[PDB]
Design a protein around this nucleic acid. Sequence first.
RNA 1: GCGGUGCGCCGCGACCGGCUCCGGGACGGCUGGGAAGGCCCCGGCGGGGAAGGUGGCCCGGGGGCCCCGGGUGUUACAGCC
RNA 2: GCCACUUUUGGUAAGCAGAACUGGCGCUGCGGGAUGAACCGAACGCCGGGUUAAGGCGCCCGAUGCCGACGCUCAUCAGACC
RNA 3: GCGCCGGAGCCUCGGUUGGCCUCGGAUAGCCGGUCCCCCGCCGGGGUCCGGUGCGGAGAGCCCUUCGUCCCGGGAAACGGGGCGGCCGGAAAGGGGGCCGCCCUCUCGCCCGUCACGCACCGCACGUUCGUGGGGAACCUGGCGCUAAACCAUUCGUAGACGAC
Lengths: 176, 109, 190, 199, 247, 138
Amino acid sequence: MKASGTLREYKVVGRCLPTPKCRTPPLYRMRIFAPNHVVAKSRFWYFVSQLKKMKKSSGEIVYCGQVFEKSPLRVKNFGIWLRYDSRSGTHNMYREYRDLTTAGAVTQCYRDMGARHRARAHSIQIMKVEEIAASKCRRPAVKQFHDSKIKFPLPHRVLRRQHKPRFTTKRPNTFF
Amino acid sequence: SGRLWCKAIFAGYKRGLRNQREHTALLKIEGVYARDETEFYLGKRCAYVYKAKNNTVTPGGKPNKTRVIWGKVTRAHGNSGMVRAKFRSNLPAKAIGHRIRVMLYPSRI
Amino acid sequence: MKTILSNQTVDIPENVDISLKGRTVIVKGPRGTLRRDFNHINVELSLLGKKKKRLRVDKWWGNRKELATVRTICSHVQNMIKGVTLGFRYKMRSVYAHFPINVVIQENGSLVEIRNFLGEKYIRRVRMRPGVACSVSQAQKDELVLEGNDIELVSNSAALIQQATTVKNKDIRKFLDGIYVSEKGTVQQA
Amino acid sequence: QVLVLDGRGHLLGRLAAIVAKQVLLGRKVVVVRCEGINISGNFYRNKLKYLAFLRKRMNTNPSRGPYHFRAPSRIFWRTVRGMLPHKTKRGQAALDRLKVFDGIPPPYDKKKRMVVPAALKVVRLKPTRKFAYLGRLAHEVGWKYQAVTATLEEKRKEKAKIHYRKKKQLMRLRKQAEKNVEKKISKFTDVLKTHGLLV
Amino acid sequence: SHRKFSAPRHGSLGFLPRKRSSRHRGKVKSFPKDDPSKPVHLTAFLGYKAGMTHIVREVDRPGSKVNKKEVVEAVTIVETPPMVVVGIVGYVETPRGLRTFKTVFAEHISDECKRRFYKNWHKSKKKAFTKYCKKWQDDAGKRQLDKDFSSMKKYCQVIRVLAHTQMRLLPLRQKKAHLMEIQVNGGTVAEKLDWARERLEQQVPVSQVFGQDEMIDVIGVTKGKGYKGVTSRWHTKKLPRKTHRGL
Amino acid sequence: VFRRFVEVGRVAYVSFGPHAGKLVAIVDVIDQNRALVDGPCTRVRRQAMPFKCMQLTDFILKFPHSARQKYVRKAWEKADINTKWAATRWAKKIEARERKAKMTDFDRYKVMKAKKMRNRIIKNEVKKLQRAALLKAS
RNA sequence: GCGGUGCGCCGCGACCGGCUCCGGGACGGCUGGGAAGGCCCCGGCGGGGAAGGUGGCCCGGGGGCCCCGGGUGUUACAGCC
RNA sequence: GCCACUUUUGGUAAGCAGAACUGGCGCUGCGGGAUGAACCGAACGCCGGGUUAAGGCGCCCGAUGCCGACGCUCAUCAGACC
RNA sequence: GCGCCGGAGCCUCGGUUGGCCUCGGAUAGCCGGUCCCCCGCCGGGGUCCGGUGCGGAGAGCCCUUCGUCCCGGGAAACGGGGCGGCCGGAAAGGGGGCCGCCCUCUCGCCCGUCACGCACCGCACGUUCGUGGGGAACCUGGCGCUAAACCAUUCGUAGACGAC
Ligand SMILES: [Mg+2]
Ligand SMILES: [Mg+2]
Ligand SMILES: [Mg+2]
Ligand SMILES: [Mg+2]
Ligand SMILES: [Mg+2]
Ligand SMILES: [Mg+2]
Ligand SMILES: [Mg+2]
Ligand SMILES: [Mg+2]
Ligand SMILES: [Mg+2]
Ligand SMILES: [Mg+2]
Ligand SMILES: [Mg+2]
C-alpha cells in the first residue's frame, strides 16, 4: 500500500463462496482506507486473510463502496488505534488528530506516522478510528485547541513568493 | 521609432546531461517566467542578429555588415517560462548568453 | 508539540519605572539606570497597566527549548529591578591555611591586588568590569565586599578573583586556600 | 545594464546560486559589501570548515596548491567559481562578468544596490538558528582589512545620511508643491487616479 | 617504514625562496607602529658597513658571574653620513592595503640623488626633474603644491619622507646615491607634514634618529657565496667516503 | 506587539489559492496551520483554508465558533463589511493595481500625455520653492 | 489563352490532409436513485442533552459603561447536538 | 569463463574456492547509477515531430523560479538515495 | 618626429537597442511628519498625528522620438538655449550645484484649428549607446618638447653563463 494523496474511506464487504456444507456464508464488513477501490479490495483480502480462513479465490467481494463523510463542515476530533511494525518488534498505538473528515484524519495519521516513526504504509495497520468528543481526548496537542475564545497571532510570516521579485530593492517585511 | 522586439537570451541548446541536440535552441525571454505566461510567445519569429567582417545584402536597403539567422518559437520548456526555438540553421555556441530578438509579428491576438 | 501560548508577568514596584524600547528593556530607579538587550530571544514584551505596573512577556507557538526562555526573561528582569532598587552586594571570604592572603584595593574599588597567596610572590591584579566596586569591609577579619548594580557584572567580578586565587599542581582537597564567595545578597534590605 | 547586488543579510552559497545562473545568462553582476554576507550554522562550525579548507594543501609544493583566499570578496568569488563551469571558455567569460568587492567602493556608493529575497537570512532561516558573519570569519582566518573597511563604512554611512536628508527635504517640497498646485493639476491628477496610479 | 632515529630538520623553511635578492639595499618591510603621543621622529636610517673591532667595557648586570668584570666584545662600525631629505610620500589606507597617494619632491635635488634615476649617467643629458622643478618658482606651481600638501594633510594616513645618502663623503668607488623612504612616526598628520616639509631639502644626521645604547634592527642582503651544494648550503651530513657518485 | 489576531470571527483577505482576492470570515481553528472558514456574503463556500494563504485584517465580527453560514451572513451584513472593505485603503490600492493592470493602449497613451505635464508643473513649482527657500535664507 | 516543367538567389502568405501538445465552451449518466450545504432556531410543534458555557449572577483587576480572567449553570441579550 | 536475485557446500572470512535454477557480461551500444565489463531502465539501419522508462529538477546541468502539503531534526565528527 | 586641443572619408573587432544620482537597517517590527519640549555641533530622543500586505510602492519612479506649418485656449513668465569665477570628490577622486554678462524666444510642454513632408504601391536584419574600441595613411592651425634603454668599456659588494 502507498498512501498516495488524501485517503478515502471504503466500506467493503465480502463472503466465502456458496459451498455445499454452508450454502450461504456470513457476510463480513470492513472500514478500510485506501486511495481507490482497487487497492481497497486488496487491503480487504489482506485483513480477511489475517482474520478468517478466506482468500481471493475461496471468496468474493460483494459491495465495495465509499463512505462519504457525514459532517464535513464541523471540525471534529478523531482517536485512531494503530498497530505498526518498527525496525525491532511491532507496537500498538493510540494517536489523536483534529480534522473535518475521517479519511482526512487517517491521511494525517499515515503522514504523522511516517514523519515521526518512519513507519511506512505497508507496516502501519489501522484498526479503529472513532470520532471523539472534546473531553475524552487524551492528547495535549489536540486539547490545546479546545477553546471557545481561541486567539493567537501569526508572528513570523516568512516570505513566500520569493522569486517573483528576485532582484528587488525592498527588504521584505515579516511583521503582519 | 523604438524597439519592436522582445529581449531574449540564448541560454543553451535543448540538451540532456551527456547529450545535446543542436536542432533546438532554449530561449529565456525577459519578464515571462511561468508556463501560465509563456503562451503569448508561441509561434513568434525569433532571430539571432550578428555582425560580420565582409558585407552582405540587407533587403529593403543597401548592403552592410549585419546578418541574421531566423527562427520561430515552438513550445514551452520547464516551468520557469523557458521556451524552445528552432532556427533554420543551428545556432553557433558563440551565441550562448547573447541577445536573440524575439519579434511580435506572427500575431494571434 | 508547538504550544499555542505561554506567558508570565512581572510585577513592578512603585519607586521604579521600566520602559521597553522595542525589545530592549531599560530600568530606571533609585540607584541607577541599567538596560539589557533581549534581541536574541524572539518573544513579545507588553508593558501594561497605567503607572505601567506589569511587564508581560509572552511567546506564541513555542516548543520546549524556546518556552524555556519565557521565564528566564522574567528572572533577568526581576534581578534587574532588584539591582536597581536595592543593588547587589557579594561578600566573599578570604580563607587561608598558613600564608595570610593580603588584598589591597586600588583605583577606588576597581583593581584588586592579591598578595602572599600560598606564599607566592606573583602578585595578582584583577580588574572589576565596570560598575562594580570592590571594598575591604570592617568588623570582620577577611572579607571583600563587591558592590554594584547588576549581578552579571558583580558575580563575574567575583568569579574572576575566586579563580585568580587558585591552587595549582597540588591537592585541592587539602589546600583549601583562596577567596571564595560566601554571602550573596542585597545592599539595602526590604 | 549591471546588477549591483548588496551583500548584507544574504546566505553565501544561496546568493552564489542565483548569481551563478544570472551571470551565465549574460548579466554583469557586482555583489558589493560582501563582508556582510552571513553563513548558516554557528561560527565555530563555519570556521572549522574554513580551517579544514586551509589544511587541504598540496604537499610537495604549496605554491601550486589551492589558493585559500582570505578576503570575503574572494571567498565569495571562489564559491561562485565552484558553482560555475570554469575550466571552459564560457565559465571563464562568466567569471569575467562577475565583479565582487569588500564594502562599497566609489563606483557603486552612488548607485542603488539591489537585494535578493530568495537568498536572505530573515527569509531562509528559522529565526532561532545561529548564523555566522563572513567578514568576521575572514578576519578570524587571516583577512587583514576589517578595521579599515569598517571605518570607510562609517564614513560612507555619514555621507549617505547627508544624501538621505537632502532627498527627504526634496520629497517634502514636492508634497508641499503638489498641495499648492492641486487647483491646476487636479484635472491631470484625476485621470491618473482613474487608471490606478494614485489610489 | 619510518625513520629509525629522529633528528631535527636541516635548514629553515621560513626563509625558503633561497634565491638572489631582488634588491641590493635592504628594504624595511615594516616600520614601527606609530602613536600620536610621541614627538615626530624618523623610524629608519641608512649606513654602510666598514669593519669589525674589539672593545673593552665593564659590564654591570647584577648577579652574573661577569658582574663588574671586563668582557671584550665584537663590534661593527657602520659609517653613517647624514642623509639629505629630498621628498615626501603620502599613503592612504585602503581595503586592498595601503596605496601611495601623492609623491612630492623638493626643488634642489643633488646629483648624488639624481644619479639614482639613471642606469647610465655618462650617456644621458641629465634631464631629470627639469620640467618638475619649474613648479617651485612660479605662483601657479606653488599653489598647486599647496593644493597637494592640503590633500596629503587630509587623505593620507602614513607619511614617508624620502632621503638619500651623501656619497661624496664616502670612500667608495660609486657616486650614485641610495634613496629611501623613511616613515615619520609621531603626532597627527598636520604636525607630520609640517615637520617633513620644513626639513625638506636639508640634512638629517644619525643623532636625530637614534640614540646611544638603543636596540635597533639591521636589514640588508647577506654576503653572496655563489651556486653551492647541500653540504655547503643546507649543512646536511656528508655521506661517507665509499660513496660512488660523490659524497 | 501584535494587533491582528487569528480568532473566531475575523475577516481575512485571501492571497492565493482557489479563492484569491476575496474576504473570508474565520470560523474555527482546526490545526496549528489550518482553519475552518466561510465567506458567506462573497461566495466563499464553507470550507477549510490554510493560514498561509490568508491575510488577516482589522475587522472582528462576533459569532459563535460553530455557528452556521446563516449566522455568519447575518453578522456580516449586520456589520456591513463589504462597504468598509471597499472604503478601506487596502482595497483601494488593490483596485488601483487592478486598474493599471487593466489599462489599454490608448489610455496608456492618455496617461502618459497627462503625467508628462502633471510632472512638469510640479517640477517647476519645486524649483521655484527651492529658490524661495534660498530667498528666505537670504 | 490552355497543358507540362521550372523560379538566379533570399523570403512571406493562404487553405487542405496526416501526426501531435494544449486551451475555451457545452450536454448527460451513476452513487446512500450521491454525502453535505443553501433559503422558509434566533422552517414549524413539543421533548431532551452538555460545553471548547452565551446571557445573567457573584468573586478578582485593567479601566472609563467596556475589557480581562475564575466560578455557577442550560438558551437568556450567542449559538451547537 | 566470469557476475547477480534466491537455494546451497568448505572456510572465522574474502573482490576466496565449489555447485543448482534463471538472467546477464563475454559478443553490447544507449539513458541513469559522478566515476565503473555484469547494477536500474533499455537492446541499435539514417533522420524530423511527439512521449516515456530508470533516474532526477539550488548552481555546475535539461528540469520545482510550485506563494507545494504534514512533521522530525542542531551535530565544537550533521545528513544526504539498490 | 612626438604629445595636446582646435574637418572629409577608409580598414578591422564586435556586443548592444532609454535611464533609475546612493539612508541606515529592523524582521515578535517598521516608514513618514510636526516639533509643542529638552541638550549637543541642523542633529539625538520623549510625546502626538498619519500610513503598515508596504503606495513617500522596484507590483515602483523619471523620460517619452513622426517632423513642421497657421491661429486659439490652458501652462511658463522668476523660463529655455548659448561665455567667466565660487567650491563640493580619494576606497578604484564628480562631464556636479551656485553668482552675473551682451545675446536671443514666447519656439519647446498639454489640449484644439490647419494643411504639408516619395502615399516608394502587405514583406527581413529597422530604431540607438555612436564622434564606439583598436590600425594605417590625406589634414589645416596653435601653444609645447627635442630623451632614455640595451650592447661595447669598466667595476667585483656579484658571478657557471646570462643576471647584479
Ligand atoms: Mg604532587
Ligand atoms: Mg619518529
Ligand atoms: Mg664502490
Ligand atoms: Mg565462485
Ligand atoms: Mg548473444
Ligand atoms: Mg548490455
Ligand atoms: Mg556512486
Ligand atoms: Mg529486477
Ligand atoms: Mg526524438
Ligand atoms: Mg543530476
Ligand atoms: Mg544594431
